C-alpha cells in the first residue's frame, strides 16, 4: 500500500478551464498531496479529481484499485489518482 | 493492494532488441502476467523486467513501491512494473 497524506495546508483545489477541439466547455479541478516514494521525505504529487468530487479533507490515505488502466502499448499505468480514507 | 498473478503459462520471458540513438545496444526482457483490476476476469498486462532480473516465477504477487514515479507534469506515474511474492 501506498500512504498518501493531505496535509493541512493541501485542503483545497485550484480549476483549471478552457474549450475542447471541438467547442465543449470543461474544468478540471487539482489537488496537492504527498506520497509516500520511500526515499527520506515524501514528495510532491498534483492530483486532478474526478467530476462533481470535492477536495479530498486532510488526514491518511490510500491507492484506490480504480487509479489503474491498461494502456495502450499493453502495460500497466496511472489513469487519475484516486483515493481512500487509511 | 493490487493482486498479480503470474499463471504456468507465463513463466518465461522474450527479448527484443535494437540499437539506441547514438549506436549503443540493448535488450529488453518482456514478460506477461494478470492483473486483477476488479472487473469480471482479471486482465493482461506486458512487463518489461530491469536488466539482470530471471523472469518471476509462477504464483501471487503484489506491486513494490519502486514501481512508481513523478512524472514531468507533477502526477504520479508507473516507471515499470515492479513485483514482490504476496
Redesign the interface.
Known sequence: ??KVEIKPSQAQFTTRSGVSRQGKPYSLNEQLCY?D??NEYP??????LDEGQPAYAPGLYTVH??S???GQ??????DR?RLVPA
Chains 1, 2 share one sequence.
Open positions: 500500500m501506498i506520497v516514494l520511500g514528495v510532491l504529487v498534483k492530483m486532478t484499485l480504480s489503474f488502466k491498461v502499448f499493453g502495460s500497466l499505468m496511472i489518482l
